[PDB]
Amino acid sequence: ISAGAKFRAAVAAEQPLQVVGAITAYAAKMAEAVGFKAVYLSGGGVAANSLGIPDLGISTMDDVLVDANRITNATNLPLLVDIDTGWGGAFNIARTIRSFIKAGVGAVHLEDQVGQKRCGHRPGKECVPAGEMVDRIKAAVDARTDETFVIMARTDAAAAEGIDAAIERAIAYVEAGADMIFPEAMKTLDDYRRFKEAVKVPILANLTEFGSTPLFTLDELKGANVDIALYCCGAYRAMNKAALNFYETVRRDGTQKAAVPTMQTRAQLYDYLGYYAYEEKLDQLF
Amino acid sequence: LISAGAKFRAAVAAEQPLQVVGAITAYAAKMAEAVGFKAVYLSGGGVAANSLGIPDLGISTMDDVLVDANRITNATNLPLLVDIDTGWGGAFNIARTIRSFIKAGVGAVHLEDQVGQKRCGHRPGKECVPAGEMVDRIKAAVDARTDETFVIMARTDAAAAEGIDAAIERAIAYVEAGADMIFPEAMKTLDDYRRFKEAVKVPILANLTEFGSTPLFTLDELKGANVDIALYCCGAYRAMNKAALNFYETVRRDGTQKAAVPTMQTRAQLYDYLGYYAYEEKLDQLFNQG
Amino acid sequence: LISAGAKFRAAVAAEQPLQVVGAITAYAAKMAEAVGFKAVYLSGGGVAANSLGIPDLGISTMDDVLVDANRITNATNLPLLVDIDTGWGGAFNIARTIRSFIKAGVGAVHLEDQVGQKRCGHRPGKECVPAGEMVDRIKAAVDARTDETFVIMARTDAAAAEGIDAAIERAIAYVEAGADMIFPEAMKTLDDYRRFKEAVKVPILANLTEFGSTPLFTLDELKGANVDIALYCCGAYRAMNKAALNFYETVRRDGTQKAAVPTMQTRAQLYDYLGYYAYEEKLDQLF
């Protein structure tokens, strides 16, 4: 029963569907325990946390691969993955799609940002002409070996070209075979409503903190006809503050005593780890 | 440019006892460096639970630890200490292990006297091998070592089942076999450490682990006991896991993360520690023509 | 939508005995398919000596084999059989192994009943576990298997030290434990194979390896013996390794490779088997 199918089922069963970002395998396991139906691997998340570098397109397909693998082996929730521009031309996009299907990843999102650029370039927010993204999607859809796997198109056109330009690109992207649409940086509930009505496929709302977008509630979004609510980064920002706090209190106090009330207990780890199931499996066989 | 091993030896000479903190990600290590620590640690059970999502039952392979170890040494220039369990096999494998982690740019490593591969259906759980068998393990590691500044540290769990004196005996044999430093597990009093340092005469590590049997000794207490290294191996990631769980729960409960944002690290903060503007300042210095 | 496992079982049914050839690299496997074989093999010692440059002394890790296995199943559509030695550890590790190789798109996997790790300074020799320890190994594997089409094959080296009948008895116990097929190491006669197939009643593999004890039996000989799989595990790489040494030698001797160019596959043939022109079509068929 395929990962793609698990993801499509989850969108049909919960409206809007909450999907939370995880930076580690264990994070995902927790997200599962808490009752979510889908998890997300952020591209900038891979780069900052796993690699220790800014989100400047330094991140390679394999970097994202090793994380995506660790995660789908650890949870049985469908995982959605940020694959930037696909890391190259039509043949590379193809390799990408195939690699991430094989990794057991359930849905995937491609974006209409300029790709590789001019050695000395500084790093900005340009789009590609609609026919250039249409090419990308076409390559992706043809490379796809199992139709249940979800190919989602992400667009940041709205910011520079206005929301109508964005809607018109989006329709061309569904034309080219994209299953769902991720419109970046919408300012109002109405923006979403209009978008959903125009493109007529499932839509994702990126609920990002410290951005421009307000942090809309599940109900707000349900009323707006949005299909997917995405909390991409909260988890790791929360965990990174907790970790800095630990380090500071150890360096200041000469002991970590003051920070132990902010820790998870061993029994809670074993519980989430499904640790008791092993001693169990060992019995059942022997 | 100085070797990772030399950096670690220098750090022990320079700070007594030396605080060394565990990090489960590259970024965590970066933060530890920013806060002023001189050395960082990669915990074996840390790799297994966090990176892989599985208990510490020796399922973790050398390669699992390798990818994490590489990501970390690439991201900080503080010397890193790595838990390498039993070395993942016989003398030939211990050799490959040693070579691999040297090349990875690590500065120190620690092998334990735990029993290697049990029977297939065996239960999980602690047990040491004969002393004479760990001596073999160390011998293979010392031999494979290509650069003497690289630190090989021997870890023993013998104290718990054979008493402290037996453990001290083993440790002397382990220094004989070439071990540079000793990591004695599960000491209950400051005296235990004092005696141990006295007997083995090489640098000694204290594992300050929370929710264990070991009390959480202070830097002073340990300095007075003549301990060389204070190791906070797991705190960081336990803290971070709680914060994560809390995020997830408040999102599922409230239909928004609003309530949780005060518990997050800002973006401006992320960029400070991410060295972010130093990148912009390179593209300019390299390609601006004015 | 046919899984690597089902492709392999189908290929056993369709060709008897089935010829299955070893490949050390992705390209090798592409050739093997072009030549018309229905299945390919990734040899454990093959990984170790060629990819890693080290002897077959159990140094090779599960990930070493994984990366090669991945490259190969990405590059051909034939089902692949992989040597996974002892499974790289206890029941939990055997499980991780089975799951990892399933995901890698491998069709079939053989495990052997050798001992795992022993004393640190133990010399490289050959030893068997109790028939019971290997039953546990198989049980772990079968349980971890998520798709029954995936073939779990048990290999035994018992014959050598305990005689043919002990080995037969083990094998029946391994089928008991869930093993789909059996790989009996080092048989001397066509009769050995015949009796073995008769007793174990599941598909049987014959390891046709060069420079060993085993004679190089022909397809017909094996057909008449009731053998299901003929395995040529290493020929390919020994052939290519000599070719390579020869090239290095002639270059160091002559100060040019001119003498060696007749042994080389042409830039042009390479390009064809990699199916380079099929990419042009795609670009055209897309844009």
Added chain:
Amino acid sequence: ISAGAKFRAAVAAEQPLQVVGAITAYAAKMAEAVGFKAVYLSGGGVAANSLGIPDLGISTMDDVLVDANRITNATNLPLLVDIDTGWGGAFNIARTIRSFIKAGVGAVHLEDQVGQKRCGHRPGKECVPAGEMVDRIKAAVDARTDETFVIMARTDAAAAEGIDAAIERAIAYVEAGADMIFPEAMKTLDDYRRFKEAVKVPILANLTEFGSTPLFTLDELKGANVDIALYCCGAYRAMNKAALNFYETVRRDGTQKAAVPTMQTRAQLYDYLGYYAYEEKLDQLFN
């Protein structure tokens, strides 16, 4: 002693220096046994052999990484690696240089070609503004943490812009910090002679079979003042034919009998692989 230093030493000690490509760790070991002072990792070599796909810039930095690691672990000769255009902008080139330093490689070669392009664009080599390749090199030189590591600039300009334009670019590339230059597709011995005299740094000659370039002798190149003779692909073309031949004889004859005189023996594999040396250490350590 760094692998950068080993490589620079080797160029000073043997002129011109012969350097041969290896597609596997074992191949490299053989190359060393035969007496070569350096080996080469071909970009197209990684793509075709390890991956099973054409040299159309599909190959990633990691693909080349895993092969590069396997090789430098298995031989102690300095290795030279084809790194194409560096796999992205200035920050990617930087990551690339750092990665290949830490992998123990000794010299890298960057080339002034185009990358990447419009999703749909067909294969066909085109160069960039010289201004752009200078930026690439600057990025590399800056990211380099150990001077002894050799950064080599490769250009394909001669083919479309004439030999003079190429010499001009080359001088600008040495300006930008490039240590040595690799001028693609020279037709005559004189082309090389003029180039070395113009750029005044060490020069590489790509001795490629089935190409345009004649297969020049060590002497011919010595007389032309060339520093490095590069046999990048011979080895694996030779080994690929031997392998196809194996597969064909097996499918034809129903046995490999006819092929075994092509094969490198078991006894020979063990030599080349250090083998006994493992046993000798167990004695060293535990007797």
